Amino acid sequence: EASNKSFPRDWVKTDPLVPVLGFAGWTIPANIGVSAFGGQSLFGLFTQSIGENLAHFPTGPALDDKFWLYLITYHLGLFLTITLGQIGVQGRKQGYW
Amino acid sequence: MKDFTTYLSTAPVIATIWFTFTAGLLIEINRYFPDPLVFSF
Amino acid sequence: KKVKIAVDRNPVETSFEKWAKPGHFSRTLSKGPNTTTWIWNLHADAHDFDSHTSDLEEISRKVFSAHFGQLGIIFIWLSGMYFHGARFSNYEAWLSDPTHIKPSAQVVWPIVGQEILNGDVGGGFQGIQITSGFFQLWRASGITSELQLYTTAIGGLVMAAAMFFAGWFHYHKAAPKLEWFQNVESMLNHHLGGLLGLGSLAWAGHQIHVSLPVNKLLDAGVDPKEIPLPHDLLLNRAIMADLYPSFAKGIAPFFTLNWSEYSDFLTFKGGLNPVTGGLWLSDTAHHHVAIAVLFLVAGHMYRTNWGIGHSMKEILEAHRGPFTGEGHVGLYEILTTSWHAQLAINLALFGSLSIIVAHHMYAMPPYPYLATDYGTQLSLFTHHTWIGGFCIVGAGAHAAIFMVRDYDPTNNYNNLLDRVIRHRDAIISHLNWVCIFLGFHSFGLYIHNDTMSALGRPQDMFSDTAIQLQPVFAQWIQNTHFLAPQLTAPNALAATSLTWGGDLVAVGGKVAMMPISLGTSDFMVHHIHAFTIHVTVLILLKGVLFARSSRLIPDKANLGFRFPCDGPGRGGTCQVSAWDHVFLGLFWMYNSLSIVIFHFSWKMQSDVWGTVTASGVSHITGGNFAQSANTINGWLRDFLWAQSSQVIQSYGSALSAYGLIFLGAHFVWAFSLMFLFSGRGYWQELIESIVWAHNKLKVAPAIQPRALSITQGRAVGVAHYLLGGIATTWSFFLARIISVG
Amino acid sequence: GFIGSSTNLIMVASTTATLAAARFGLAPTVKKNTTAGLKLVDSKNSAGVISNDPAGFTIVDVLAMGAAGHGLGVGIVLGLKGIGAL
Amino acid sequence: KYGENSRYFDLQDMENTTGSWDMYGVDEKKRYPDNQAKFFTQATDIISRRESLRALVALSGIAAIVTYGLKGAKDADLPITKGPQTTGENGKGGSVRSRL
Amino acid sequence: KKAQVISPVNGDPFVGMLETPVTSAPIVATYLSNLPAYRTGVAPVLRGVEIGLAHGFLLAGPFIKLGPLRNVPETAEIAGSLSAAGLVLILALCLSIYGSAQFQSTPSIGVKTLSGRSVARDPLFSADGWSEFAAGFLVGGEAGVAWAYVCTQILPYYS
Numbered sequence A: 001e002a003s004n005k006s007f008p009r010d011w012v013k014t015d016p017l018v019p020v021l022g023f024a025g026w027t028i029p030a031n032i033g034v035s036a037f038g039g040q041s042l043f044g045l046f047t048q049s050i051g052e053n054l055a056h057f058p059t060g061p062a063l064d065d066k067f068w069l070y071l072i073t074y075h076l077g078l079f080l081t082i083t084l085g086q087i088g089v090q091g092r093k094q095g096y097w
Numbered sequence B: 001m002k003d004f005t006t007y008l009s010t011a012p013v014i015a016t017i018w019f020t021f022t023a024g025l026l027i028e029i030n031r032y033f034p035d036p037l038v039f040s041f
Numbered sequence C: 001k002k003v004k005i006a007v008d009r010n011p012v013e014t015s016f017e018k019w020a021k022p023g024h025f026s027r028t029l030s031k032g033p034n035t036t037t038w039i040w041n042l043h044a045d046a047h048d049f050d051s052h053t054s055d056l057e058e059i060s061r062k063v064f065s066a067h068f069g070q071l072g073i074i075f076i077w078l079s080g081m082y083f084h085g086a087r088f089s090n091y092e093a094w095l096s097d098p099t100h101i102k103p104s105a106q107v108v109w110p111i112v113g114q115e116i117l118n119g120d121v122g123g124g125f126q127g128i129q130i131t132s133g134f135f136q137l138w139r140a141s142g143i144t145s146e147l148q149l150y151t152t153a154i155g156g157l158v159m160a161a162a163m164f165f166a167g168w169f170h171y172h173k174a175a176p177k178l179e180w181f182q183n184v185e186s187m188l189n190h191h192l193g194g195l196l197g198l199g200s201l202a203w204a205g206h207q208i209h210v211s212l213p214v215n216k217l218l219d220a221g222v223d224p225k226e227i228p229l230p231h232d233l234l235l236n237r238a239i240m241a242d243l244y245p246s247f248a249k250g251i252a253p254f255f256t257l258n259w260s261e262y263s264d265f266l267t268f269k270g271g272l273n274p275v276t277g278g279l280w281l282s283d284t285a286h287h288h289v290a291i292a293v294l295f296l297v298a299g300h301m302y303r304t305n306w307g308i309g310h311s312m313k314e315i316l317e318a319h320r321g322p323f324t325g326e327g328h329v330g331l332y333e334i335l336t337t338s339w340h341a342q343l344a345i346n347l348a349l350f351g352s353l354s355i356i357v358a359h360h361m362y363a364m365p366p367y368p369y370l371a372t373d374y375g376t377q378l379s380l381f382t383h384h385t386w387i388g389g390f391c392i393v394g395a396g397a398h399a400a401i402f403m404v405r406d407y408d409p410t411n412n413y414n415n416l417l418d419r420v421i422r423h424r425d426a427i428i429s430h431l432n433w434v435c436i437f438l439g440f441h442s443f444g445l446y447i448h449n450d451t452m453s454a455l456g457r458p459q460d461m462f463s464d465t466a467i468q469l470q471p472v473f474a475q476w477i478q479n480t481h482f483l484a485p486q487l488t489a490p491n492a493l494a495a496t497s498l499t500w501g502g503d504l505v506a507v508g509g510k511v512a513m514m515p516i517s518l519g520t521s522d523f524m525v526h527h528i529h530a531f532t533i534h535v536t537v538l539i540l541l542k543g544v545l546f547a548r549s550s551r552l553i554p555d556k557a558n559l560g561f562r563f564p565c566d567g568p569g570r571g572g573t574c575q576v577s578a579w580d581h582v583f584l585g586l587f588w589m590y591n592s593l594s595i596v597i598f599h600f601s602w603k604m605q606s607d608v609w610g611t612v613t614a615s616g617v618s619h620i621t622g623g624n625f626a627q628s629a630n631t632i633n634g635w636l637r638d639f640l641w642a643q644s645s646q647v648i649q650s651y652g653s654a655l656s657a658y659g660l661i662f663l664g665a666h667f668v669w670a671f672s673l674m675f676l677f678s679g680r681g682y683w684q685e686l687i688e689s690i691v692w693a694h695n696k697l698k699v700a701p702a703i704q705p706r707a708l709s710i711t712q713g714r715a716v717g718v719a720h721y722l723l724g725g726i727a728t729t730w731s732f733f734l735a736r737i738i739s740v741g
Numbered sequence D: 001g002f003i004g005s006s007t008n009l010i011m012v013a014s015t016t017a018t019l020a021a022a023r024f025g026l027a028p029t030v031k032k033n034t035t036a037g038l039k040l041v042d043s044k045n046s047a048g049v050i051s052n053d054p055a056g057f058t059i060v061d062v063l064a065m066g067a068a069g070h071g072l073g074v075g076i077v078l079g080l081k082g083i084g085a086l
Numbered sequence E: 001k002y003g004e005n006s007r008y009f010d011l012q013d014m015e016n017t018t019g020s021w022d023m024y025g026v027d028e029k030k031r032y033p034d035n036q037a038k039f040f041t042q043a044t045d046i047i048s049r050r051e052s053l054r055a056l057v058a059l060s061g062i063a064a065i066v067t068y069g070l071k072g073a074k075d076a077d078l079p080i081t082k083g084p085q086t087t088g089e090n091g092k093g094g095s096v097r098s099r100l
Numbered sequence F: 001k002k003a004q005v006i007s008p009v010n011g012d013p014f015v016g017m018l019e020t021p022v023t024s025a026p027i028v029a030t031y032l033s034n035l036p037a038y039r040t041g042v043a044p045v046l047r048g049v050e051i052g053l054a055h056g057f058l059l060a061g062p063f064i065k066l067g068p069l070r071n072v073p074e075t076a077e078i079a080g081s082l083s084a085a086g087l088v089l090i091l092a093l094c095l096s097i098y099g100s101a102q103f104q105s106t107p108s109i110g111v112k113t114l115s116g117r118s119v120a121r122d123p124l125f126s127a128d129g130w131s132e133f134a135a136g137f138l139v140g141g142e143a144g145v146a147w148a149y150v151c152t153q154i155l156p157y158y159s
């Protein structure tokens, strides 16, 4: 490493467009209703469960709630979309292809 | 086949053959003279 | 073209003159023995082909032909199993009544009273109750006869002769050049598309045409002699159409993409056959078709001789980030130039695969009447788990061998390997910390519970009653897979396993598989597993990363991969070698997998396996894993001491060999401790005091007696330790589960 | 009648689509590979192979794109059969 | 100097050479309210020496264990202070010989 | 393919720390610099008081909720607070004897700040500084244990 003498402070080359665009690229397809959810959506059912579990705020969700499935799947896709958007943006600006 | 019989004279091959022989002799002795606890014959 | 067949013609003369010269492959062993250390080194260096020569071509040729030898030996072994099933078996009797007849395929000769081992297994037969699962595998293949097993044995012997001929041919007659081995793209294309794709497709075809009809008739109560032979099902489409109506339509639905017509024999039922307790062979056939297509498309991924495909070098050299520097640059050369790197990766994944196989074959029993043969199930899990652990430790070993021998810092500058070696201290420090944290918060829980139970404070234990450590993530995953056919796998009729939840499948009154409930004891023992795994990883990864150099010894690569020490200096540098890190990782893999298989045995005997006498399941041990596996004294009392009553009381039975091997494995294990606790300097002096007595009587050998090298002392010790422990567990498990299951 | 079916037309459309995409510079061919960024660039071809086309479209290209279009059409046919749109 | 042209050895800068750095320390004098700092500099005035602190620790710990054995264990209602509350395992010596 | 993140420490590739996001991210560096351990100009007694308050308050929870008297309603909190007081006392003892053992050799090399300017050694790392630091730790830790009990008694939503 002939470069990197002082650990640049901008180690994450931040683009504020990246989180917004990953969020919109995931949640908008996640707002498409499909046959498997009974016509509903993943984000729709996730927010529905968020509401149903905020109706008793202290009491957390159960093991049999289905809020955890929506949570984990939604955030799998969302984190993947956000990190791949950051990677793609900073590879486009930089080299990498 | 001088080299092959030199191979068969090696320590592991000769040991295998000799112990197969000894074990077979003991096994046949114990088949034809079963359960020899004492020398009585 | 670049991808082509390239061979040397008659490189090596087929001659016996080097058989008669032991140690020809080495320049340090060709000089003949003067000490017995030569006799040991001749066997330690026999297959270290990279220490015989240094050019990769002859190494690769030796490796190829030795693989052919291994395949020929495996074929001999398989033909022997099939032949013993054809000649020394109760298989035809077992097909007619698999729920009462114990599978046996080994008969003992009546010579020294050992005909007591020829036990009453059933079917008018006397022999050794086997635990290999070969009967269930043969019934799944649709054998139904000893003649078919005999001809499979003959075919296996023919294929073994073919493999040995091929080794001789590809070493001595037409041996491939180095550029032929380095065609990794074509090798992967053929091994994915052909070895795994065409192989899975051919097995799918066998299952479509032989296994499925034969087993559908076997499950319909048809006696195996009334069942049509496989060729009658191949020739007569009317019989297959009578069993599966989609065969009336032919192969037209396949080419017209009307694949749903084949839903008679290509299903997605999931769960288990309620008649056999095994997987639906229609699901299995569809599975093999699917993965055949998958591997056949996967084997068209790499670029060999036409423009289409990938260059793996490009993929690697393109995968780099801001954290990893140059990235995977220089790994294609590593893995096309070093056999030990490939062996490391391949052994790692093969052992992980064997363990995955173990975990997936008990939960989704793929063979008929396998789930209720509790001995077969336990033995298969234990066996493949052990093979996997051994392969993983070997992966560590050969990664270290690569790092010592084949690593070059010129080809690795600021790439992933350089950057891993450059922060090895952080890796190993955090691994050490997590190992200590896991050891505490896993085993100290058991110690806390033992102390509380001994103190008379069961309300202070980490139990399902007092202080619940519930594995809620695993419980959630269980519930999610159980409810998959409802939401997330709607075309599946049932879940993959009954272990997720639901009802039990009872075959012959015995439980084939039933839901496994996870509680505090399961939490504790899974964290024990994680702990032991992390420590094994610690030892092996420390041997890999510190194979070339350390803060203690900076020139460790010049000492080699396999050296005893550097000396008693620096306070003492014993076992700084990477070989010694493998030597210790073996002990820790043993300690890990022993608990793995103990957890499996107890969990199965307590919460899954058992009989359905009335409406209600009576488990083998009685469901005591939940309340007794919280303590070490529970594992000692309710598992080791209790379940040993079948192996120590087996004298006078057909299981007496298991008690004998129990005791003998104890003996071998303790005998390992003479080599592990001791050192070479005592034994050389004892040997010279004995050599005095031999010189006095003029029987002093010319090959001077030496003590075993330090490395060989450690190797003998760990080998005897593993053998004794594993055979002790083997005898204990088998004597227990043949009796109670 | 299969010839004229929805399946048949889907399959011929998919195969001809992949063939026309490769032949007319819209898909990677034997002569044109792609970089890490999906831009078509000349390949080295690893053997050299002769074709009289104006574009160097090999029968290897016809095989590759027939397989790709057959996969595309099979997936499309069976997914429209899955969602009930066929 | 020490960062000029990969010159990571300086005899006049042995701090940068040996890596003697305060990676996170800040020498700012201002952290706490001065009345609070006064309160806590005076609260510890008596025990700010090793001997005084160890005297406090000895006194407190010995007093604590003694009052715990005399009073605190019984206040905690410990089973060792309550006694068996039963005839105990007195007459059941062994399974064979039921000894007292 | 520019912009590598992980750098050698202060640009010195032979000291061996490898500055990294977890090490030298400005949020992380800021948070760790603002901790009383790294306030090298502040009196060690007051940094000890803060550290001790924090630790005495935090290590009472385990003794309260997981101790041997955790299932007795009003006795759980008292027993846990007293266990924490004892542990804080032991820790003050250990701190004192560490100050006695460690600070006898008086290192001679100076310190810098990853920027070039040499700073004075932390007075904490002397005999007197560590003794007053341990006094502060004892005072603050007993105070924080007492405050942990007070919070058991006065916080609305304490279970």
Ligand code: CLA
Pocket: C012, C013, C014, C015, C016, C018, C019, C024, C025, C061, C062, C063, C065, C066, C068, C069, C073, C164, C165, C166, C167, C168, C171, C172
């Ligand atoms: C009769 C046929 C024949 C002959 C004369 C030779 C002759 C030779 N070979 Mg070739 N070879 C043959 C067959 C033959 N080979 C076959 C069939 C294979 C395929 C496996 C090979 C593969 C091969 C390789 C890869 C190499 C040779 C080498 C050699 C040379 C010396 C080998 C040596 O020391 O042998 C004595 C060795 C043995 C007798 C060991 C045999 C081990 C067998 C294969 C496995 C048995 C395992 C056994 C079941 C384990 C039981 C365990 C026990 C506890 C029960 C010599 C030129 C070596 C060389 O350097 O050539 C220049 C070399 O590297 N050969």
Ligand code: CLA
Pocket: C063, C064, C067, C068, C071, C180, C181, C183, C184, C186, C187, C190, C191, C193, C194, C195
């Ligand atoms: C479709 C083509 C194909 C197939 C099926 C295989 C299959 C295999 N190869 Mg591979 N290989 C291939 C192409 C193929 N290879 C190409 C193109 C190259 C050059 C790059 C290599 C280079 C290569 C090396 C360097 C090695 C292998 C090895 C192996 C064996 C691994 C062990 C195993 O899985 O046991 C499964 C066992 C079976 C499925 C039993 C059936 C075995 C059949 C008879 C052989 C497969 C057909 C053969 C490749 C074609 C020639 C036929 C012959 C009559 C002329 C396996 C048999 C390893 C090995 O063990 O060597 C012996 C090994 O070291 N191969």
Ligand code: CLA
Pocket: C201, C202, C203, C204, C205, C206, C208, C209, C233, C234, C235, C236, C237, C240, C246, C247, C248, C249, C250, C251, C254, C262, C289
């Ligand atoms: C490798 C796997 C495999 C194999 C070998 C077979 C083989 C077969 N299947 Mg099966 N099948 C498979 C996978 C497989 N299938 C899978 C995965 C599925 C699910 C989609 C099916 C579904 C399925 C159905 C639904 C049906 C079959 C049928 C058939 C048979 C008809 C073959 C046919 O019409 O194709 C045509 C094949 C050929 C034309 C190749 C023959 C070429 C010969 C060997 C050339 C040799 C000539 C030589 C050079 C000269 C002579 C030599 C000498 C005398 C001189 C045949 C036995 C049908 C049947 O009748 O079953 C009983 C049937 O109805 N299969």
Ligand code: CLA
Pocket: C043, C044, C045, C046, C047, C048, C049, C343, C347, C390, C391, C392, C393, C394, C395, C397, C398, C401, C561, C562, C579, C582, C583, C719, C723
């Ligand atoms: C695909 C599997 C595979 C392959 C191809 C290799 C290949 C190799 N290994 Mg690796 N290795 C493997 C798996 C593998 N190993 C596993 C699983 C382990 C963990 C146990 C190791 C651990 C290991 C170490 C620690 C070392 C090697 C070494 C070697 C090299 C020479 C080995 C030799 O000459 O032994 C020849 C064969 C023997 C000496 C026989 C050993 C017999 C064992 C100890 C007894 C077990 C037999 C039986 C199961 C027990 C019952 C027997 C009964 C009679 C009582 C060679 C490159 C050595 C090397 O490269 O040196 C630089 C080396 O130091 N390997």
Ligand SMILES: CC1=C(/C=C/C(C)=C/C=C/C(C)=C/C=C/C=C(C)/C=C/C=C(C)/C=C/C2=C(C)CCCC2(C)C)C(C)(C)CCC1
Pocket: C078, C151, C152, C153, C154, C155, C156, C157, C159, C198, C199, C201, C202
């Ligand atoms: C068990 C065993 C045995 C036996 C085995 C066997 C018997 C096997 C077989 C195998 C086989 C018997 C195989 C076969 C295969 C086949 C195949 C693999 C086929 C394929 C096909 C394809 C791939 C196709 C393609 C296509 C189509 C689809 C149409 C037209 C066009 C084309 C042609 C392109 C022995 C004795 C060795 C011993 C050991 C064990």
Ligand SMILES: CC1=C(/C=C/C(C)=C/C=C/C(C)=C/C=C/C=C(C)/C=C/C=C(C)/C=C/C2=C(C)CCCC2(C)C)C(C)(C)CCC1
Pocket: C293, C297, D015, D062, D063, D064, D065, D066, D067, D068, D070, D071, D072, D074
């Ligand atoms: C002469 C010429 C012409 C015409 C031509 C033509 C017309 C051609 C055609 C061609 C074609 C028409 C081709 C085709 C191909 C095909 C293929 C190649 C196929 C393949 C298949 C496959 C590969 C399969 C696969 C699979 C299966 C089997 C199952 C499922 C899955 C998968 C998909 C994988 C022109 C223009 C006029 C001009 C001049 C030249």
Ligand SMILES: CC1=C(C/C=C(\C)CCC[C@H](C)CCC[C@H](C)CCCC(C)C)C(=O)c2ccccc2C1=O
Pocket: C674, C675, C676, C678, C679, C680, C683, C684, C706, C707, C708, C709, C710, C712, C713, C714
């Ligand atoms: C016991 C022991 C020995 C002594 C073991 C001896 C040297 C090996 C004995 C192997 C066999 C018994 C000798 C082989 C002799 C012939 C090959 C056998 C053929 C004839 C038989 C029928 C007798 C060591 O040299 C040693 C070295 C380093 C650490 C621990 C130890 C250690 O524990």
